[PDB]
């Protein structure tokens, strides 16, 4: 029974290595990673891989690993797939911990934009969680934390993290993680998966997929939002992704909005993440 070596980048930046039979489905590897992580609330998470075009793909747990990674290495990341709109409702602290690690990467990477004050507040809760109570000993007037807090670090941001850290005396790791999440969850790009596209006139837009629906970023002045309820039907054909929108009360016919994606695989990928989010956020 021939087994393939799998390497998984965990949310703390460390590598987990295991073996699975070469005809294994993605669920087999995912179950092994989740057990390694002592994670029970597995529904929010998944494994990503990079395809032959270097795009991030979700590893489908129901399909053979080999028929997804195809010609590529058996190298994966462990990621949040469905960002809970109310992290306080998760049953375990360890779930909330992994969600925090994902969000810290979302922030440092610039996928999750954040004001100066919110970067420093989020930062201060991570420090409280990881080091415990503020200690003046590990912080002179020239302190810079090992912790990555932001896509661009400034001495002013480092100072503001420390100032807010001082206010969190007595806060336990679970408490600090919950405060982190209560703030992060409110950010306008929280849990938003962004896809480059063109509208039916060839104008460059972004399509965002999240818990509440599909977003269309045309410009800062023009953001259309389709709650899952309003979305009747979704489909892809060639390089195109089409969305059917419910008629308003006492309108006869649905509207179709068509989008052009970079290529057929980018269209299919957007279609599948939409399918997944609708099913998830219709059951949650
Ligand atoms: N198999 C079926 O009978 N349905 C058809 C509609 N479909 C859907 C998917 C995504 C979305 F955004 C809106 C609707 C769910 C599956």
Curated annotation (Swiss-Prot):
Does the record's keyword annotation contain Phosphoprotein? Answer: yes
| Domain FERM intervals | 4-284
Question: In which tissues has expression of this protein been reported?
Answer: Expressed at high levels in brain, with lower levels in kidney, intestine, and testis. Detected in lung.
Q: Where in the cell is it found?
A: Cytoplasm, Cytoskeleton; Cell junction; Cell membrane; Cytoplasm
Primary location class: cytoplasm
Q: Which GO terms describe its cellular component?
A: cell junction; cell-cell junction; ciliary basal body; cilium; cytoskeleton; cytosol; glutamatergic synapse; juxtaparanode region of axon
GO BP term (any one): protein localization to paranode region of axon
Q: Which UniProt keywords apply?
A: Acetylation, Actin-binding, Apoptosis, Cell junction, Cell membrane, Cytoplasm, Cytoskeleton, Membrane, Phosphoprotein, Tumor suppressor
Q: From what superkingdom does this record's organism come?
A: Eukaryota
Q: Which GO terms describe its molecular function?
A: actin binding; cytoskeletal protein-membrane anchor activity; structural constituent of cytoskeleton
Note the subunit structure.
Interacts (via FERM domain) with CADM1. Interacts (via FERM domain) with PRMT3; the interaction is direct and inhibits the protein-arginine N-methyltransferase activity of PRMT3. Interacts with PRMT5. Interacts with PRMT6.
The role this protein plays is:
Tumor suppressor that inhibits cell proliferation and promotes apoptosis. Modulates the activity of protein arginine N-methyltransferases, including PRMT3 and PRMT5.
Could you identify this protein by its name? Band 4.1-like protein 3
Gene name, per UniProt, is EPB41L3
């Amino acid at each position: 029974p021939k087994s393939m070596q799998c390497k998984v980048i965990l949310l703390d930046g460390s590598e987990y290595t295991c073996d699975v039979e070469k005809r294994s489905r993605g669920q087999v590897l995912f179950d092994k990673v989740c057990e390694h992580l002592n994670l029970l609330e597995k529904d929010y998470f998944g494994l990503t891989y990079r395809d032959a075009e270097n795009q991030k793909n979700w590893l489908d747990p129901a399909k053979e690993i080999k028929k997804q990674v195809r010609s590529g290495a058996w190298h994966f990341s462990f990621n949040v797939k469905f960002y809970p709109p109310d992290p306080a409702q998760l049953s375990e602290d360890i779930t909330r911990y992994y969600l925090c690690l994902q969000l810290r990467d979302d922030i440092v990477s610039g996928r999750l934009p954040c004001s100066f004050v919110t970067l420093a507040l989020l930062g201060s809760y991570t420090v409280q969680s990881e080091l415990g109570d503020y200690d003046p000993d590990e912080c002179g007037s020239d302190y810079i934390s090992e912790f990555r807090f932001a896509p661009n670090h400034t001495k002013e941001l480092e100072d503001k993290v420390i100032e807010l850290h001082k206010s969190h005396r007595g806060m336990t790791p679970a408490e600090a993680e919950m405060h982190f999440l209560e703030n992060a969850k409110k950010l306008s790009m929280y849990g938003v998966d962004l896809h480059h596209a063109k509208d039916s006139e060839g104008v460059e837009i972004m399509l965002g997929v999240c818990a509440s629906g599909l977003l269309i970023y045309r410009d800062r002045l023009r953001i259309n939002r389709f709650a899952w309820p309003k979305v009747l039907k979704i489909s892809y054909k060639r390089n195109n992704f089409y969305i059917k929108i419910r008629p308003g009360e006492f309108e006869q016919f649905e509207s179709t909005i068509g989008f052009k994606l970079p290529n057929h695989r980018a269209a299919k990928r957007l279609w599948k993440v939409c399918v997944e989010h609708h099913t998830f956020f219709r059951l949650l």
